[PDB]
Symmetry: D2
Subunit: 257 residues, 4 copies
């Protein structure tokens, strides 16, 4: 198979990267960072996100692998000392797929894919937007911002915002609030909201039309925005599985001890 390896850039990661390339050169494996079939990220969840976004155009043709040089990640969940064992097995394994989040920004119109989440915040001013679920006006939100999370991205930002952690087999999306004002005047649901496939959540500007929008790592101020559409993507990310590392055990190791 064709393959490639990205690295956090620190000493430990590049050296582990060169060792895997060296071991890969002992097999029928061509290194190609243009049309790989296997993408190996070495570093952290952050390095893995970048790896994903570098190859989001060939998602269904790639199987991803995450090696953590530092602390255990949710995407980078293979230990360095398992790299050699990883190489042999890749020389031939099952695939596990996770849901993705599609974000649409209209003015033209730009579409994005998120692996963790997309968020919306205000550009140096009060953030007020109308939330419309499947064309039905649901609430007028006033606060810092909102966050729409993929299932696997719920252990990240979503978690800090009070969202629930959801198993990646569930094809869904989760909206959480960031510091919502709630008085007699303004009213929001408060609770996080989990949407199934085909549900479309649309954020519409009330007065200001300039938002700071984020999709995973990349955060860009968008001007003259007319709408932000959130819905579970039809595309999925594919991981290569070599053993059992249950999502709930990954949660336990990361958060409980």
């Amino acid at each position: 198979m064709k393959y490639m390896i990205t690295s956090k850039g620190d000493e430990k990661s590049d050296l582990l990267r060169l060792n895997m390339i060296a071991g890969f050169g002992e097999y029928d494996m061509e290194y190609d960072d243009v049309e790989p079939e296997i993408v190996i990220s070495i570093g952290g969840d952050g390095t893995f996100l970048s790896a994903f976004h570098q190859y989001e155009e060939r998602l269904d043709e790639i199987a991803f692998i995450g090696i953590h040089t530092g602390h255990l990640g949710f995407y980078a969940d293979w230990r360095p000392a398992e790299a050699d064992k990883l190489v042999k097995l890749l020389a031939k394994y099952q695939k596990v797929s996770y849901p993705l989040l599609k974000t649409t920004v209209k003015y033209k119109e730009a579409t994005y894919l998120a692996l963790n989440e997309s968020t919306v915040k205000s550009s140096g001013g009060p953030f007020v937007v109308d939330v419309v679920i499947n064309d039905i006006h649901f609430e007028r939100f006033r606060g810092d911002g909102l966050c729409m999370s993929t299932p696997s991205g719920t252990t990240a930002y979503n978690k800090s915002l009070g969202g629930a952690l959801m198993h990646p087999s569930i094809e869904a999306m989760q909206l959480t609030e960031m510091a919502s004002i709630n008085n007699r005047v303004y009213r929001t649901i408060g609770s996080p909201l989990v949407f199934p496939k085909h549900h479309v959540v649309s954020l519409q500007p009330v007065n200001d039309k300039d938002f700071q929008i984020s999709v995973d790592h990349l955060s860009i101020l968008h001007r003259d925005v007319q709408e932000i559409r959130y819905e579970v993507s039809a595309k999925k990310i594919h991981f290569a599985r070599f053993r059992s590392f249950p999502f709930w055990r990954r949660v336990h190791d990361s958060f409980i001890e």
Copy 2:
């Protein structure tokens, strides 16, 4: 079809009940509260829960309908003045089904079905239980109790405990904490947790083996409990639909205005 009608018991509900029976007697509809095919609840979500639990043994043979005499419910979501229109249409409609929660209590062994949630609390003492997800020890919980919620039951108790609201089409279950102690000694996940079908969450007593266990309305102290097993049921509840009343619009009307 065979049918029956339960009532909150107040004046408005019994009179609306007799009027529907009267209108039903104008059609080919036999009243049978033993083997009905249609069960109509008149009152609130509470009256509907009772109606459900009265016929939990014939769930797949029944289609439920909820009329709210008081404030709009999540199960009792038909207005009184729509009763006459409801009668005609029932004389012949589509069905919508919601996931249920199976709870197993072992000592023998007793199984239950919940429409909203099942909770576990301590019997006049400190509540400590081990949480095991799919046979993997996940955490040791110390607090007031835990709550496992169906999708449709998330707008209820689950909501107050900080859980997220999830759409009933998603076949899942949600575990939330009740006042968990978190220090250097004790550690719980904090976030609510959403499990898919086939996931089994098991609560195991640490020292005390007496818990106050609840399934919807009914709450009973169980002694010598060895285990409590939570998993999405294979059975579902079937509603009769006569028009569009989206779950998210039902949420909006109940919580936003």
Copy 3:
């Protein structure tokens, strides 16, 4: 001075207790568990609470000391190996005082003192009470219960309920909610509330008049309750200080590492 020592009852605590008594017998110190001037608790915060409540009638005549045999406490914050050093110094030290919470239950009328908190919960049914602050009706609460916490008791139950941690020098009280229902029908403030001295918070039964009331460790069901009054006590608990152990450092050690 006259003194006494209580013990958790385990092996380590009684032996540390006898060693201190032995060392105390080397000085001018009479052991008297009737009218002590110094009360030394050996065990945990729990053992200290009991020690407090055993001598709540002579609070202003006693100086308390807490030795933790187990993990560091907020009241039991002296290490065992500091006991010998503690004995010498007690043979002669500054005093630090903490606010207390007075609870009044009317039917006659019973008054209590709390070192951590007092809580109110329902007796096997729905909990609904009116909250009246200084004779002004503030809200109708519907949920599991409420909790009124002393400043030093905020790191305990109050903390789990989402309350804020407040420095014991501040003479105040904190009310937090337990799973409050909030919809279009019912409305509570949600936020915890901090009251100054002389503010009186009164809980009044709406329908049911039977509550499970708790003051620290002791929890008793009260019947025919007409009112529960909360206000910062005029009495304070006095600790004996031998060195600097700042409240915020005590918080750090307990919760951060």
Copy 4:
């Protein structure tokens, strides 16, 4: 007395402003917006904040009054139709004072006064700062930002962040977190923290030294920041009281109905 009146700028506010000036010209009252003894704000809490910050250099020489043209405020708590009655009484009343928050930013060094709160956020990057309470390292915070609130400012931003509402007679300050990351690696207290007078909370940059700092309305990016110091101010704001409008009744009207 010398006096002045600020206005939200809309039609209703300027006309109410001119009417009060007209009525004031019937008494011994000189209009002076340089050295007033009475400052009357007409609009909302926002218009009142501006009024405060315009005269923060003569706080102890001024008595403030807030008239709400729109919805009831916490500072603008006089109804328009009470303006005429207000004028007569001002022609001669008791004063109520609220604590303030002093913020110090070091690089030189700049000091500020806040009526609601001061917050710290990151400049287009990860926010990480060390929290030091009275020179003792308390925690390393990683998240969106932190918020330090005055007592009267707790019903504002502090409230949305989960803080508790505290009575303005209590001389204190409240720190709340904004989306703190909490895993095995990073650990924060989570709970809001209430500090008494003379406690100094200091935020120190870990890697990045550029923060977006806010004091009430004004928000400015500060570069090369070395420290941010929070402590209850020695200065207080003085209101003119003409009748009883209890803080807890002001809370009820704003949030409960």
